[PDB]
Amino acid sequence: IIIATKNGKVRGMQLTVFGGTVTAFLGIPYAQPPLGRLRFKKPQSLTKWSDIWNATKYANSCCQNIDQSFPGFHGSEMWNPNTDLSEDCLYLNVWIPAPKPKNATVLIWIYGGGFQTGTSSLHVYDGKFLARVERVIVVSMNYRVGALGFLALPGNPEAPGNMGLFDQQLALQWVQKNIAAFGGNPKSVTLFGESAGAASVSLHLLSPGSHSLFTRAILQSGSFNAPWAVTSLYEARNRTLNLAKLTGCSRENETEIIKCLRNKDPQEILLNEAFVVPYGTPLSVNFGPTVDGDFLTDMPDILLELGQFKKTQILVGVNKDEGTAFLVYGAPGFSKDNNSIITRKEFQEGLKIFFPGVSEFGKESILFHYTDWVDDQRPENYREALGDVVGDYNFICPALEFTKKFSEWGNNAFFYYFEHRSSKLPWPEWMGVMHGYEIEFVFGLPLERRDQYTKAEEILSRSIVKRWANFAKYGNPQETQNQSTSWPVFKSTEQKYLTLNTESTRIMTKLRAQQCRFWTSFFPKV
Ligand SMILES: *[C@@H]1O[C@H](CO[C@H]2O[C@@H](C)[C@@H](O)[C@@H](O)[C@@H]2O)[C@@H](O[C@@H]2O[C@H](CO)[C@@H](O)[C@H](O)[C@H]2NC(C)=O)[C@H](O)[C@H]1NC(C)=O
Ligand SMILES: *[C@@H]1O[C@H](CO[C@H]2O[C@@H](C)[C@@H](O)[C@@H](O)[C@@H]2O)[C@@H](O)[C@H](O)[C@H]1NC(C)=O
Ligand SMILES: Nc1c2c(nc3cc(Cl)ccc13)C[C@@H]1CC(CC[NH3+])=C[C@H]2C1
Ligand SMILES: *[C@@H]1O[C@H](CO)[C@@H](O)[C@H](O)[C@H]1NC(C)=O
Numbered sequence: 001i002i003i004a005t006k007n008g009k010v011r012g013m014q015l016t017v018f019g020g021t022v023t024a025f026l027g028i029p030y031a032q033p034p035l036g037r038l039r040f041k042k043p044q045s046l047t048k049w050s051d052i053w054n055a056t057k058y059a060n061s062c063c064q065n066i067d068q069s070f071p072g073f074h075g076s077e078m079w080n081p082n083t084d085l086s087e088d089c090l091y092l093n094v095w096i097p098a099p100k101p102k103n104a105t106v107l108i109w110i111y112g113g114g115f116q117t118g119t120s121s122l123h124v125y126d127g128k129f130l131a132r133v134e135r136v137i138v139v140s141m142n143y144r145v146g147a148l149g150f151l152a153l154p155g156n157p158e159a160p161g162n163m164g165l166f167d168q169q170l171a172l173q174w175v176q177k178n179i180a181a182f183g184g185n186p187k188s189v190t191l192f193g194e195s196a197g198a199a200s201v202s203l204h205l206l207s208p209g210s211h212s213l214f215t216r217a218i219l220q221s222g223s224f225n226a227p228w229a230v231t232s233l234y235e236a237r238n239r240t241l242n243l244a245k246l247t248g249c250s251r252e253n254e255t256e257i258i259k260c261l262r263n264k265d266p267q268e269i270l271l272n273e274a275f276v277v278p279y280g281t282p283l284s285v286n287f288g289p290t291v292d293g294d295f296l297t298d299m300p301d302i303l304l305e306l307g308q309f310k311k312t313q314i315l316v317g318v319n320k321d322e323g324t325a326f327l328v329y330g331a332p333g334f335s336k337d338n339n340s341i342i343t344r345k346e347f348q349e350g351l352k353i354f355f356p357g358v359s360e361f362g363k364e365s366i367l368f369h370y371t372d373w374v375d376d377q378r379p380e381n382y383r384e385a386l387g388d389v390v391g392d393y394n395f396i397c398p399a400l401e402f403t404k405k406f407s408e409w410g411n412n413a414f415f416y417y418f419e420h421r422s423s424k425l426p427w428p429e430w431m432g433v434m435h436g437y438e439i440e441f442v443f444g445l446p447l448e449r450r451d452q453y454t455k456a457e458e459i460l461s462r463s464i465v466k467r468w469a470n471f472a473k474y475g476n477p478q479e480t481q482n483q484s485t486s487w488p489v490f491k492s493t494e495q496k497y498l499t500l501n502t503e504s505t506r507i508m509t510k511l512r513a514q515q516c517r518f519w520t521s522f523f524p525k526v
């Protein structure tokens, strides 16, 4: 089975899924390998090839530092790359239903990883289930991360910043030019991603170069107005110059620094990426999106506030316990192997870890707002409070503020609150409904009865898969057949959202009302 693209013929492989067939094209190149003189530059378009590219396996993952905090632990190694690391990594994957669809809606996945790590070949991003069940076309791409994808000396075309975002954008360009040959509809393309991938998706709503490359957007546990999402240009310059000094590349002529870094081998850059920031936190984004004046023409907060974004429908949501995952990466008294019951003192030292450059009054304000106990006696109180502090500040409240600002300019928005803890979650119970563990349900992994998800989890995954596909195809995330509850539009006034759980489903209003008033209105003033 062979498909002719604008740059050459590609050969896929047939897969058996749920008694049916899905055709997979793994590892299709979409740019020149950013090697040598092309390192740190924007991605270059492909040149023709006369042969047949055998797109039969996942391609290389981009260079990145691997999470080594828990060796042998599936809870952390599930996120580590499962293919070879290489600078030659800008490839994409396409899952098409069998037989070839006529005009199928396309879903483009942008993985997360704090803009430092990630790859499209992860088991939990396997798009064959969605292609099998909803007969949509799933596309995922690899984009450069870390310094190799986001180092910025702005205005300098040798290292202008946002290369990884331009990598994603060139992949969307590829879908627009080629997906029709796979039976796809280039006019029905929905981007979706998680965490830094969701922040990437939200930035594509702002980028002028991305306006006509997709139709709708889904933002899972992330948005560009999150505190970790966008680095200022003065911060980007210091961290670029800091990396230069650590590698012996400090030159006067800024163009010379880049060429020096272009001749350091990738691992010297990787080992030094960690030390470019002096005030580290578990949510530190060493090299990330900047206002480059090309992909991003202005400060994203300004464009969001004044309505300069693509007018379309969005699907946004968060998980119940977004913050717990980061506590075991620095917070004192916390561990994945005990119940992490902390004292008031350890809670306060935890605030210093996550809010290092915040005044003493600002941290007393955080403490005051998160210690109005329902029950004074619960030993879990400070443990769960710091989890809620990290989760609301870094994910939930930014996501809610984005959805409210976006809907204020007339577009339909839908907000969800995912609150089911996976029965196969390798992390301890106290970490709850963790950041990143709605992804398996979105991609339909519980529909595979071979894994021992509950039957309730298969039903929940089946319903979420239908809502996601219905949003991509029709702009409305309803599940109309099985007498579900209707998902109402999120409006700036009432602010309704939908809970996703195995037990029931409810329409609620004003999620984290008191908490997000503090983080979004008051806390920026301290
Ligand atoms: C939950 O575990 C943390 C960390 O536990 C690590 O430290 C070992 C001493 C051992 O307990 C093992 O479980 C693990 O490798 C506990 O915090 C630690 O407490 C000790 C003193 O008791 C300090 O010296 C450590 O620096 C400190 N580590 C961290 C990361 O804070 C914590 O006490 C424990 N909680 C409960 C309720 O048991
Ligand atoms: C600008 O850079 C200054 C130098 O960074 C060094 O700081 C050390 C503490 C260590 O991290 C070295 O690896 C760095 O090279 C730093 O002191 C300033 O604070 C920076 N200013 C800002 C605003 O970030
Ligand atoms: N800096 C980050 C990292 C990751 N995600 C992040 C998510 C956010 Cl919102 C912010 C920063 C992140 C995923 C990887 C894991 C870790 C742990 C390293 N032991 C640091 C990197 C790499
Ligand atoms: C591609 O795969 C086919 C089938 O496995 C194989 O016969 C062929 O030699 C491979 N290489 C090509 C076509 O260059």
Ligand SMILES: *[C@@H]1O[C@H](CO)[C@@H](O)[C@H](O)[C@H]1NC(C)=O
Residues within 6 Å of the ligand: 102, 103, 185, 187, 188
């Ligand atoms: C796919 O749908 C679009 C409208 O969304 C239409 O313009 C186009 O002709 C269709 N292509 C087909 C049916 O091949």
Ligand SMILES: *[C@@H]1O[C@H](CO)[C@@H](O)[C@H](O)[C@H]1NC(C)=O
Residues within 6 Å of the ligand: 253, 254, 255, 256
């Ligand atoms: C830096 O060097 C490049 C090439 O070596 C040159 O084109 C550029 O003008 C130099 N910059 C300055 C400020 O001289």
Ligand SMILES: *[C@@H]1O[C@H](CO)[C@@H](O)[C@H](O)[C@H]1NC(C)=O
Residues within 6 Å of the ligand: 462, 463, 466, 479, 481, 482
């Ligand atoms: C609706 O329920 C039936 C059986 O109860 C199930 O087979 C089907 O997959 C469900 N559909 C959705 C969209 O959940």
Ligand SMILES: [Br-]
Residues within 6 Å of the ligand: 112, 113, 114, 194, 195, 196
């Ligand atoms: Br992440």
Ligand SMILES: [Cl-]
Residues within 6 Å of the ligand: 228, 283, 284, 285, 286
């Ligand atoms: Cl940061």
Ligand SMILES: [Cl-]
Residues within 6 Å of the ligand: 320
């Ligand atoms: Cl809650």
Ligand SMILES: [Cl-]
Residues within 6 Å of the ligand: 344
């Ligand atoms: Cl107390």
Ligand SMILES: [Cl-]
Residues within 6 Å of the ligand: 483, 484, 485, 504, 505
């Ligand atoms: Cl329901």
